């Protein structure tokens, strides 16, 4: 319902899907010859099936194929400065695929739409829907467009005739924030006590020995640390 969604929103007012409390299969995403761009920051595409995150956001919009480059950490351009801003410490990844047969039509598809005009560069992960016109000249427009008074929003003009870089390319951004809940399949084996093992407790990897803890926890506390990021005690997630 994120990827084969019938309608994607425009890049100024893109749609957000919250993903939580499920098991994600990333084999079907990396193992597809449809996605032109599959480039991942902070994670590798191969080891995404063994990482387990608190929450996953899915951001969907349509840009032309020439500016899939701008959807990246620390890029500049129009879409990156005014429509869609990714932070420089971005974890998660952006993908794209060609959608000429669904979003471009004869006579031009004037539904998909982008902001060109804004006074300031956009904050990352804070995205606006406002429709007040832009005053580039000195005369106050007072909400009247005309000369030196531009509406800041206009369409892309998607033609099937134009080149590969001007075709509509559906961009779906995945973001991972690292009590983890969203992770792929692996055999959750039995606990092994009093032995030097390689634990993987809900993504908290490491090695050590596992005994019971006599110290009292509270129902909201997942794991325990004593000093300087050392994982002292843990709860099994089952």
């Amino acid at each position: 319902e994120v990827f084969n969604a019938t309608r994607f929103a425009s890049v100024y007012a893109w749609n957000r899907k919250r993903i939580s409390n499920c098991v994600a299969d990333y084999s079907v995403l990396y193992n597809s010859a449809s996605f032109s761009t599959f480039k991942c920051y902070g994670v590798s595409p191969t080891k995404l099936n063994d990482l387990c995150f608190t929450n996953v956001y899915a951001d969907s919009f349509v840009i032309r194929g020439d500016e899939v480059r701008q959807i990246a950490p620390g890029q500049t351009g129009k879409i990156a400065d005014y429509n869609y801003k990714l932070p420089d410490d971005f974890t998660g990844c952006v993908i794209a695929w060609n959608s000429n047969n669904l979003d471009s039509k004869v006579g031009g598809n004037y539904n998909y739409l982008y902001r060109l005009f804004r006074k300031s560069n956009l904050k990352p992960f804070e995205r606006d829907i406002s429709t007040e016109i832009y005053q580039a000249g000195s005369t106050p427009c007072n909400g009247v467009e005309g000369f030196n008074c531009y509406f800041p929003l206009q369409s892309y003009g998607f033609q099937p005739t134009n080149g590969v870089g001007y075709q509509p390319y559906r961009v779906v951004v995945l973001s991972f924030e690292l009590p983890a809940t969203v992770c792929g399949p692996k055999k959750s084996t039995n606990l092994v006590k009093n032995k030097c093992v390689n634990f993987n407790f809900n993504g908290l990897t490491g090695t050590g020995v596992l005994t019971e803890s006599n110290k009292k926890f509270l129902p909201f506390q997942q794991f325990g640390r004593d000093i300087a990021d050392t994982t002292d005690a843990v709860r099994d997630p089952q």
Partner: antibody
Amino acid sequence: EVQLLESGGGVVQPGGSLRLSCAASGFAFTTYAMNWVRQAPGRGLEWVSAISDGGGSAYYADSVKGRFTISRDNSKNTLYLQMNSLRAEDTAVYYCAKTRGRGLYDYVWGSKDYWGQGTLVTVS
Amino acid sequence: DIVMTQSPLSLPVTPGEPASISCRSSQSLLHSNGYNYLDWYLQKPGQSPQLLIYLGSNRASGVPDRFSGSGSGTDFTLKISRVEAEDVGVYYCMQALQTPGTFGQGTRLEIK
């Protein structure tokens, strides 16, 4: 490039319904405002209805409050005007015409730069 | 509402001569932003009407330069410097302040 197409409007018995559909081809129909105009043969124009972006704000003229039903589809870029309780004085040239207005004080019922192609409704 | 008046209605003007067209308003159309809100139109016979001048002064799209509107407050005037056979039409006036969009009675320009 930009032009407006209409459909429907013809011979109709009074006191019933009719359909008129306005489809757009070359503009940003989400962002532009939209307006409705009646023109009788032999006297000039009369505004009847107007709508803002995304529905919500619908306005009616003095004789047509409740008589006319207005609706908007932002997906298929079509403008509708559902028709109720037709009268012989409603025999007029009905056509969709668009407005500039996108500013705060541009007043969606105001400056209408383009007008549509045109069709005649005969209530007889 | 706004009781509107276009006078005189039938205008026989020799081609090449200037023609002066007026529309009058009961209430002041000057808003708090200082701009004029009254719009000037032309209807060709059998062809859909056009916006000629918006807001009293400025270029509507495709309108030739010899069409010019004037006025402030209530007394506005539309002027053409040169009238030709393509300038035949019936001239209207519409406001944008109140709820009903009030039209003019129509100023028929005729060629002698």
